[PDB]
Design an enzyme around this catalytic site. Structure first.
Site, PDB file in Angstrom:
ATOM      1  N   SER A 147       0.797  -1.629   0.169  1.00  0.00           N
ATOM      2  CA  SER A 147       0.475   0.215   0.064  1.00  0.00           C
ATOM      3  C   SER A 147       0.840   1.191   0.168  1.00  0.00           C
ATOM      4  O   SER A 147      -0.102   2.265  -0.040  1.00  0.00           O
ATOM      5  CB  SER A 147      -0.766  -0.111   1.231  1.00  0.00           C
ATOM      6  OG  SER A 147      -1.867  -0.721   0.418  1.00  0.00           O
ATOM      7  N   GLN A 191     -10.839  -4.847   0.091  1.00  0.00           N
ATOM      8  CA  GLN A 191     -10.264  -5.472  -1.444  1.00  0.00           C
ATOM      9  C   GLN A 191     -11.537  -5.895  -2.229  1.00  0.00           C
ATOM     10  O   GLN A 191     -12.924  -6.064  -2.037  1.00  0.00           O
ATOM     11  CB  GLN A 191      -9.862  -6.715  -0.555  1.00  0.00           C
ATOM     12  CG  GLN A 191      -8.735  -6.623   0.610  1.00  0.00           C
ATOM     13  CD  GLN A 191      -9.208  -7.549   1.471  1.00  0.00           C
ATOM     14  OE1 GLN A 191     -10.492  -7.609   1.851  1.00  0.00           O
ATOM     15  NE2 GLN A 191      -8.224  -8.228   2.933  1.00  0.00           N
ATOM     16  N   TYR A 248     -10.697   2.705   5.462  1.00  0.00           N
ATOM     17  CA  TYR A 248      -9.889   2.678   4.592  1.00  0.00           C
ATOM     18  C   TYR A 248      -9.712   1.429   3.077  1.00  0.00           C
ATOM     19  O   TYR A 248     -10.633   0.388   3.375  1.00  0.00           O
ATOM     20  CB  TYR A 248      -8.504   2.551   5.218  1.00  0.00           C
ATOM     21  CG  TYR A 248      -6.998   1.807   4.635  1.00  0.00           C
ATOM     22  CD1 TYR A 248      -6.845   0.657   4.243  1.00  0.00           C
ATOM     23  CD2 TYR A 248      -6.465   3.093   3.751  1.00  0.00           C
ATOM     24  CE1 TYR A 248      -5.356   0.524   3.848  1.00  0.00           C
ATOM     25  CE2 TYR A 248      -4.886   2.720   2.988  1.00  0.00           C
ATOM     26  CZ  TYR A 248      -5.122   0.911   3.010  1.00  0.00           C
ATOM     27  OH  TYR A 248      -3.756   1.439   2.429  1.00  0.00           O
ATOM     28  N   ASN A 299      -8.493  -0.758  -0.960  1.00  0.00           N
ATOM     29  CA  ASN A 299      -7.961  -1.030  -2.052  1.00  0.00           C
ATOM     30  C   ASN A 299      -8.859  -0.526  -3.247  1.00  0.00           C
ATOM     31  O   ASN A 299      -8.659   0.269  -4.050  1.00  0.00           O
ATOM     32  CB  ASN A 299      -7.924  -2.125  -2.491  1.00  0.00           C
ATOM     33  CG  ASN A 299      -6.256  -2.542  -1.533  1.00  0.00           C
ATOM     34  OD1 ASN A 299      -6.242  -1.746  -0.401  1.00  0.00           O
ATOM     35  ND2 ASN A 299      -5.687  -3.890  -1.529  1.00  0.00           N
ATOM     36  N   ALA A 326       2.152  -3.272   2.531  1.00  0.00           N
ATOM     37  CA  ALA A 326       1.950  -4.700   3.428  1.00  0.00           C
ATOM     38  C   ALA A 326       1.238  -5.078   1.812  1.00  0.00           C
ATOM     39  O   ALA A 326       0.376  -4.863   1.017  1.00  0.00           O
ATOM     40  CB  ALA A 326       1.413  -5.221   4.468  1.00  0.00           C
ATOM     41  N   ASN A 351       5.411  -9.506   6.413  1.00  0.00           N
ATOM     42  CA  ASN A 351       4.858  -8.454   6.451  1.00  0.00           C
ATOM     43  C   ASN A 351       4.416  -8.650   8.395  1.00  0.00           C
ATOM     44  O   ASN A 351       3.829  -9.810   8.998  1.00  0.00           O
ATOM     45  CB  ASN A 351       3.077  -9.157   5.641  1.00  0.00           C
ATOM     46  CG  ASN A 351       2.076  -8.095   6.316  1.00  0.00           C
ATOM     47  OD1 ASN A 351       2.287  -7.041   7.276  1.00  0.00           O
ATOM     48  ND2 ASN A 351       1.447  -8.632   6.199  1.00  0.00           N
TER      49      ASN A 351
HETATM   50  B1  LIG Z   1      -2.502  -1.667   1.758  1.00  0.00           B
HETATM   51  O1  LIG Z   1      -3.099  -1.467   3.029  1.00  0.00           O
HETATM   52  O2  LIG Z   1      -0.596  -2.569   1.835  1.00  0.00           O
HETATM   53  C1  LIG Z   1      -2.986  -3.373   1.236  1.00  0.00           C
HETATM   54  N1  LIG Z   1      -1.987  -4.120   0.635  1.00  0.00           N
HETATM   55  C2  LIG Z   1      -2.637  -5.246   0.159  1.00  0.00           C
HETATM   56  O3  LIG Z   1      -3.953  -5.251  -0.468  1.00  0.00           O
HETATM   57  C3  LIG Z   1      -1.530  -6.319  -0.944  1.00  0.00           C
HETATM   58  C4  LIG Z   1      -1.949  -7.743  -0.499  1.00  0.00           C
HETATM   59  C5  LIG Z   1      -1.668  -8.884  -1.091  1.00  0.00           C
HETATM   60  C6  LIG Z   1      -2.082  -9.818  -0.499  1.00  0.00           C
HETATM   61  C7  LIG Z   1      -1.808  -9.191   1.221  1.00  0.00           C
HETATM   62  S1  LIG Z   1      -1.769  -7.392   1.477  1.00  0.00           S
HETATM   63  C8  LIG Z   1      -3.799  -4.039   2.397  1.00  0.00           C
HETATM   64  C9  LIG Z   1      -5.244  -3.826   2.242  1.00  0.00           C
HETATM   65  C10 LIG Z   1      -6.350  -4.716   3.214  1.00  0.00           C
HETATM   66  C11 LIG Z   1      -5.668  -5.464   4.189  1.00  0.00           C
HETATM   67  C12 LIG Z   1      -4.451  -5.585   4.215  1.00  0.00           C
HETATM   68  C13 LIG Z   1      -3.473  -4.738   3.015  1.00  0.00           C
END
Ligand SMILES: *[B]([O])([O])[C]([N]C(=O)[C]C1=[C][C]=[C]S1)C1=[C][C]=[C][C]=[C]1
Ligand SMILES: [K+]
EC number: 3.5.2.6
Length: 358
Positions: free
Chosen positions: A61, A117, A147, A149, A315, A340
């Site tokens: 992120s 997500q 928050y 994505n 992450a 992570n």
């Molecule tokens: B961000 O907040 O780091 C975001 N990252 C991702 O969606 C990338 C990932 C792929 C697999 C696991 S994390 C995030 C959003 C919601 C939950 C965790 C991380």
């Protein structure tokens, strides 16, 4: 390097690596504008490849800070306006809940509860439109921050439509190239695979998997040198020669909404400095709980405030990143790891280091 920086970084990071069992880590401290680099451990445990200043890490992120700046650059170019309704750029989004949802709401997670997500089953352009058409908001826009994505990811995809470029091409030509981030990638080329660290989850080597709006929400990979340059660029935007990019960086640190002690920018989040780590954790997405928080609009947005702790956590399944900087002290830090580990531990370490050097 200055001994004070060497000492606080090693005395803070070594115990962090031990406590969190991180396989490899790179850290950059930007002090009075100059970067200082540190590395530990392994990019690839099996092949015994060490972390170096050229190792690529998945930013997760933290990629949202690049999306926010690219969107700011599009506003500066006159291509989009944050006040524009989402439907101006995606007419096909005809469902009524979209009335009143603007690009500002997408960019700042205030559209009314877009999900965290995008589902894995969403794989085509048609699937994505269906997903947004079927989404039912829990709240009116501009009332609560959640928050997500799917919110800033959609902002990124729409922000580049007027340009006629793909999101990746727009990012490369408008942000990476001007800032000389020459080892920063949305898709790692085969030539660079030798430097791509493996992430580690439950002890297994893993890389992020393709997903809808991945580039826009969590898909950048970069080195500690390029990330230090990214922090420098955000600390001192006035030194950037490309006018629209300088303006875009300034727009991404403007304060659009407030909830408790935190202010939401475009990608970046900010708190007034001075502030302690407990307040940063509770005033950010670094906390363990996923939170719906009512927001107050900042009408009009406050231009980038110098005395701020500006930061972003990131992450992926196998990586953990953190960036923080304080403009008025010309001070910043980047921490990239191929595990992570808990966000609060990232904030604690970053604060310990920057507080000692300010
Ligand atoms: B961000 O907040 O780091 C975001 N990252 C991702 O969606 C990338 C990932 C792929 C697999 C696991 S994390 C995030 C959003 C919601 C939950 C965790 C991380
Ligand atoms: K994609």
């Amino acid at each position: 390097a200055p001994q004070q920086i060497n000492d606080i970084v090693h005395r803070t990071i070594t115990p962090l690596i031990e406590q969190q069992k991180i396989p490899g880590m790179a850290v950059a401290v930007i002090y009075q504008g100059k970067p200082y680099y540190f590395t530990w451990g392994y990019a690839d445990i099996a092949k015994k490849q060490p972390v170096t200043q050229q190792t690529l890490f998945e930013l997760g992120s933290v990629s949202k800070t690049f999306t926010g700046v690219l969107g700011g650059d599009a506003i500066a170019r006159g291509e989009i306006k944050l006040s524009d309704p989402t439907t101006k750029y995606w007419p096909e989004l005809t469902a009524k809940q979209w009335n009143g949802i603007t690009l500002l709401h997408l960019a700042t997670y205030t559209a009314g509860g877009l999900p965290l997500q995008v589902p894995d089953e969403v794989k085509s352009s048609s699937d994505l439109l269906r997903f947004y058409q079927n989404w039912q908001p829990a709240w009116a826009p501009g009332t609560q921050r959640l928050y997500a994505n799917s919110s800033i990811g959609l902002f990124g995809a729409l922000a580049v439509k007027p340009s006629g470029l793909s999101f990746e091409q727009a990012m490369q030509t408008r942000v990476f190239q001007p800032l000389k981030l020459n080892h920063t990638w949305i898709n790692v080329p085969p030539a660079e695979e030798k430097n791509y660290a493996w992430g580690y989850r439950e002890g297994k080597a893993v890389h992020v998997s393709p997903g809808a709006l991945d580039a826009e929400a969590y898909g950048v990979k970069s080195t500690i040198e390029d990330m230090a340059r990214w922090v420098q660029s955000n600390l001192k935007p006035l030194d950037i020669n490309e006018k629209t990019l300088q303006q875009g960086i300034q727009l991404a640190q403007s304060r659009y909404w407030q909830t408790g002690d935190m202010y939401q920018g475009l990608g970046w989040e900010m708190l007034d400095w001075p502030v302690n780590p407990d307040s940063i954790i509770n005033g950010s997405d670094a906390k363990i709980a996923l939170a719906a928080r009512p927001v107050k609009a900042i009408t009009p947005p406050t231009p980038a405030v110098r005395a701020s702790w500006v930061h972003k956590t990131g992450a992926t399944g196998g990586f953990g990143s953190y960036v923080a900087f304080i403009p008025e002290k010309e001070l910043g830090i980047v921490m990239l790891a191929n595990k992570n580990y808990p966000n609060p531990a990232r904030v604690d370490a970053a604060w310990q280091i920057l507080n000692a050097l300010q």
